């Protein structure tokens, strides 16, 4: 009576200054004429979807909804806001106040109005709203996804659905750069045939409608020629390419030099500098060029606190107005500490862009990455102004991690990874949220066992409980209470997974059915591992029997393509098998 609903992102400023109130079958619409075009179509769609009519003219008594910019200049808006303004905020900023009856939305620019609507959309529940005073704006100005992974590229529907999802969580950047789109890279010189072109146009259109900058990436580095007529012919292919995507409405571009053998720092930068001049600037309404250098992680870029040969020359040749992306201290790493970003930003003498390789799983596909942004410094905004994550080829399940990235990048300072993660699953899964948390909590840590690792540890509280069990048994202390609690945990893993199998929407189930079965198998080996232990009671029969099962469950898990809970549910079984409790 009446609480604020989960919001994503977390708005900069929000306080309850009322009990909230129901919105009528019919509201008062004021401002649609002036307000941002896209912010309004998003309103009408929400309004439609929710059995909420727009008054052909006033009252009664209707709930009063008022919307527009600050340029735009309306009377009801100001009285409505009644103290609050979006006049002194960054681009994409807005204000929202729901005053008993009244609902006021003004953004600084069209962008912020649209976002103000998104926050409205999330605030209303049943027609009920809370009374609140909101001023909101992003920490980082560019926030989004780079579809840059290896593997089957997102389908065309996948992409439209992501692009909508991005609008609703205030992410504003989508970089188009699938490694295995032949035309992005393997055949970069070549024009998209007619029907990809048709499909490409809808991406673009859909993106503008959701205030998403659609960025067109190209990766010519495997075979591009730099010198003489060969270089002219090739640089022209780049133009031809960008032009066609310009002539479709694209006003951002990226040119990527990652994962190639040719380390011609000077030549790469010169291609970029040429494009900045001949395309970007000659066009006037194209956003800054974005690039990744062939050295794109601190280990590859730096030695002894100083740039390496390639990075040094790249840094000094490439135009200041160009956004350079780096991945952090490693290609797939635990963290980006402030000190890493300071270092990299120093070398390029600019605010940097991040290409963050999580939740992407192309380098270890058996595992789904279902955790929150983790390990990224909460003061990164000091040196970084462009933050994107590289997602899984699994579009739907990627949403959980992307959800958290939206809150990290929009409200960096207050970002809490555990709360963000919970919110994300709550917001995305509804009645299934609790069961989905159980499962996903075991699938957050990525680790290919060699060079690639990132993410929150899997099921950390269970892992500490397993640790305590071993400490009490090696000490020869009574552990029956804990043993009993772990039975409940393992039983609850299997219960949740079964509920997920039978009730998940198909769009999500098809991405995780194998991993669901993997956690069920381990939960059963976990349970059999406990029996193995209780069998303490010098019962050799029950011991051999629970042992062959624990061992079979483990072996099934080890053999299976799906990977989950390596250091927790799976490891517990190997820990239990090696705990020799038969000694006298």
- Binding site, annotated residues for a protein: 148, 179, 258, 296, 355-357, 362, 390
Helix (H) or strand (E) run with residue 219 in it: none
Among positions 292-311, residues that touch ligand VGB (CB under 6 A) are: 292, 296
553 belongs to the binding site for ligand VGB (CB under 6 A): no
Residue 252 binds ligand VGB (CB under 6 A) = no
Q: Is residue 381 close enough to count as binding Na ion by CB under 5 A?
A: no
Tokens 């039975």 -> residue: 487
447 near ligand VGB, judged by CB under 6 A: no
Q: Are 324 and 292 in contact (CB under 8 A)?
A: yes
> Does residue number 226 form part of the binding site for Cl ion (CB under 5 A)?
yes
Q: Which of 180, 259, 416, 517 is catalytic?
A: 259
Q: Which is nearer to ligand VGB, 348 or 355 (CB)?
A: 355
Tokens 């729901």 locate to 98
Min dist. Cβ of residue 260 to ligand VGB (A): 10
Under the criterion CB under 5 A, does residue 227 sit at the interface with Cl ion?
A: yes
Q: How far apart are CA 297 and CA 357, in angstroms?
A: 11
The SS3 assignment for 435 reads helix
Tell which residues of the chain come right before a gap with C–N over 2.5 A.
Answer: 535
Binding site feature residues: 148, 179, 258, 296, 355-357, 362, 390
CA 19 to centroid of chain Cα atoms: 33
Picked from ligand VGB, Na ion, Cl ion, none, the partner binding residue 351 (CB below 5 to 8 A depending on kind) is Na ion
Calpha distance 12→140 (Å, rounded): 12
Residue 46 or residue 363: which is nearer to ligand VGB going by CB? 363
| Minimal distance, residue 166 CB to Na ion, in Å | 24
Beta carbon nearer to Cl ion, 203 or 522? 522
Residue 46 makes CB contacts below 8 A (sequence gap 6+) with: 117, 120, 121
Of 279 and 364, nearer to ligand VGB (C-beta) is: 364
Closest approach, Cβ 52 to ligand VGB, in A, equals 43
Helix (H) or strand (E) holding 244: helix 228-246
Q: In angstroms, give the least distance from the CB of 232 to Cl ion.
A: 11
Site string for Na ion, 311-350 (x = CB under 5 A): ---------------------------------------x
Of 512, 453, 482, 456, the C-alpha closest to 572 is 482
Residue 350 partner contact from ligand VGB, Cl ion, Na ion, none using kind-dependent CB cut-offs of 5 to 8 Å: Na ion
With binding defined as CB under 6 A, does residue 390 bind ligand VGB?
yes
Nearest Cα neighbor of 454 from 464, 462, 444 is: 444
259: annotated active-site residue: yes
The residues with which 65 forms a beta bridge, in sequence order, are 29, 103
Place of tokens 């960025």: 215
For 263-401, strand residue ranges (E) read: 290-292, 302-303, 306-307, 323-326, 352-356, 384-389
Binds ligand VGB (CB under 6 A): choice among 170, 179, 185, 394: 179
Please choose which of Cl ion, ligand VGB, Na ion, none residue 560 contacts, taking the beta carbon within 5 to 8 angstroms, the exact cut-off set by kind: Cl ion
Between 390 and 401, CB nearer to ligand VGB: 390
Tell me which residue of 327, 422, 322, 342 sits closest to 375, measured CA to CA: 327
Number of residues forming the site for ligand VGB (CB under 6 A): 17
Instruction: In angstroms, give the least distance from the CB of 521 to Cl ion.
Output: 9
Residue 137: CA atoms inside 13 Å, Cβ hemisphere, count? Answer: 18
Q: Smaller CB distance to Na ion: residue 63 or 351?
A: 351
**Closest CB 348 distance from Na ion, rounded Å:** 9
The tally of CA atoms less than 13 A away on the side-chain side of residue 255 is 25
Structure tokens at 436: 């989905």
d(CA 196, CA 248): 12
Beta partners for residue 303, in sequence order: 306
Q: How far is the CB of 146 from ligand VGB (least distance, A)?
A: 8
The verdict on 560 binding Cl ion (CB under 5 A) reads yes
Residues in the interface with Cl ion (CB under 5 A) total 5
Using CB under 5 A as the binding rule, whether residue 225 contacts Cl ion is answered as yes
Report if residue 437 touches Na ion, rule: CB under 5 A. no
Beta bridge partner(s), residue 21: 129
Q: Name the nearest CA neighbour of 454 among 491, 490, 417, 483.
A: 417
3-state secondary structure 338-355: HHHHHHHHHHHCCCEEEE
Q: How far is CA 93 from the centre of its chain?
A: 21
Q: How far is the CB of 516 from ligand VGB (least distance, A)?
A: 24
For residues 2 and 16, give the distance between their C-alpha atoms in angstroms, rounded to a whole number. Answer: 10
Q: Is 229 in the site for Cl ion (CB under 5 A)?
A: no
Residues 324-343 that bind ligand VGB (CB under 6 A): 327, 331-332
Should residue 357 be labelled a site residue for ligand VGB when binding is judged by CB under 6 A?
A: yes
CA nearest to 143, candidates 160, 167, 122 = 167
Q: Which of 114, 165, 355, 386 binds ligand VGB (CB under 6 A)?
A: 355
Cβ(400)–Cβ(482) under 8 Å?
A: no
Q: Phi, psi at residue 32, to the nearest 5°?
A: -45, -25
Q: Residue 203 or residue 353: which is nearer to Na ion going by CB?
A: 353
Of 169, 136, 109, 138, residue with least CA distance to 11:
136
Window 124-163: contact mask with ligand VGB (x via CB under 6 A): ------------------------xxx-------------
CB of 226 or CB of 246, closer to Cl ion: 226
262 binds ligand VGB (CB under 6 A): no
Q: Does 351 bind Na ion (CB under 5 A)?
A: yes
Alpha helices in 278-416 (DSSP H): 282-283, 298-301, 309-317, 338-348, 399-410
Q: Is 411 in the site for Na ion (CB under 5 A)?
A: no
Of residues 152 and 471, the one with the C-beta less far from ligand VGB: 152
Applying CB under 5 A, which residues contact Cl ion? 225-227, 560, 563
Applying CB under 6 A, which residues contact ligand VGB? 148-150, 179, 258-259, 292, 296, 327, 331-332, 355, 357, 360, 362-363, 390
For the annotated catalytic residues, the residue numbers are 259
Applying CB under 5 A, which residues contact Na ion? 350-351
């Amino acid at each position: 009576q009446v609480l604020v609903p989960n919001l994503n992102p977390t708005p900069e400023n929000l306080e309850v200054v009322g009990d909230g109130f129901k919105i009528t079958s019919s509201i008062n619409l004021v401002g649609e004429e002036e307000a941002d075009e896209n912010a309004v179509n998003a309103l009408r769609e929400f309004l439609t979807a929710n059995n909420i009519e727009i008054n052909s003219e006033n009252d009664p008594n209707s709930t009063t909804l008022i919307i527009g910019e600050v340029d735009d200049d309306i009377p009801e808006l100001d009285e409505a806001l009644n103290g609050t303004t979006a006049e002194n905020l960054k681009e994409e900023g807005y204000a929202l106040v729901s005053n008993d009856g009244k609902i006021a939305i003004e953004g600084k620019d069209g962008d912020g109005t649209f976002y103000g609507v998104q926050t409205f959309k999330q605030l209303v529940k049943e027609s009920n709203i809370p009374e609140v005073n909101i001023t909101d704006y992003p920490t980082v100005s560019a926030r989004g996804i780079v579809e840059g992974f290896y593997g089957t590229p997102w389908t065309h529907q996948d992409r439209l659905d992501q692009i909508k999802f991005y609008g609703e969580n205030k992410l504003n950047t989508y970089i188009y750069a699938p490694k295995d789109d032949p035309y992005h890279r393997e055949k970069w010189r070549e024009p998209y045939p007619e029907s990809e072109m048709q499909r490409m146009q809808e991406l673009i259109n859909a993106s503008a409608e959701n205030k998403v900058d659609f960025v067109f990436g190209i990766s010519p580095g495997i075979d591009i020629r730099f010198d003489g007529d060969a270089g002219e012919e090739d640089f022209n292919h780049l133009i031809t390419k960008a032009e066609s995507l310009y002539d479709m409405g694209v006003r951002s571009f990226a040119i990527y030099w990652d994962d190639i053998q040719d380390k011609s720092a000077a030549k790469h930068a010169q291609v970029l500098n040429r494009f900045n001049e001949e395309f970007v600037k000659a066009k006037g309404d194209v956003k800054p060029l974005i690039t990744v250098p062939t050295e794109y992680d601190t280990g590859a870029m730096v030695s002894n606190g100083q740039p390496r040969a390639y990075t040094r020359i790249f840094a000094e040749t490439v135009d200041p107005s160009i956004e350079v992306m780096w991945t952090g201290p490693g290609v797939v790493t635990n963290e980006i500490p402030l000190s890493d970003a300071q270092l990299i930003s120093g070398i390029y003498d600019r605010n940097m862009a991040v290409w963050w390789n999580y939740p992407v799983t192309d380098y270890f596909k058996g595992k789904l990455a279902l955790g929150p942004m983790h390990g990224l410094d909460k003061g990164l905004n000091q040196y970084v102004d462009f933050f994107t994550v590289n997602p899984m080829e699994h579009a739907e399940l990627s949403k959980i991690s992307i959800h958290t990235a939206a809150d990290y990048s929009w409200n960096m300072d207050n970002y809490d990874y555990d709360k963000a993660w919970n919110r994300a699953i709550d917001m995305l899964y509804g009645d299934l949220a609790e069961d989905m948390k159980v499962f996903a909590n075991h699938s957050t840590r990525m680790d290919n066992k060699t060079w690639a690792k990132s993410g929150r540890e899997d099921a950390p509280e269970l892992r500490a409980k397993m640790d305590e069990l071993w400490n009490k048994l090696s000490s020869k202390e009574d552990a029956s209470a804990l043993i009993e609690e772990l039975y409940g945990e393992f039983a609850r893993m299997e219960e949740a997974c079964n509920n997920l199998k039978a009730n998940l929407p198909e769009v999500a189930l098809e991405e995780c059915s194998r991993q669901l079965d993997e956690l069920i198998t381990l939960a059963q080996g976990d349970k059999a591992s406990l029996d193995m232990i209780v069998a303490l009671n010098e019962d050799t029969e029950a011991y051999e029997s629970a042992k062959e099962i624990a061992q079979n469950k483990l072996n099934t898990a080890l053999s299976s393509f799906a990977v989950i809970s390596e250091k927790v549910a799976q490891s517990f079984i190997q820990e239990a098998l090696s705990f020799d409790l038969t000694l006298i």
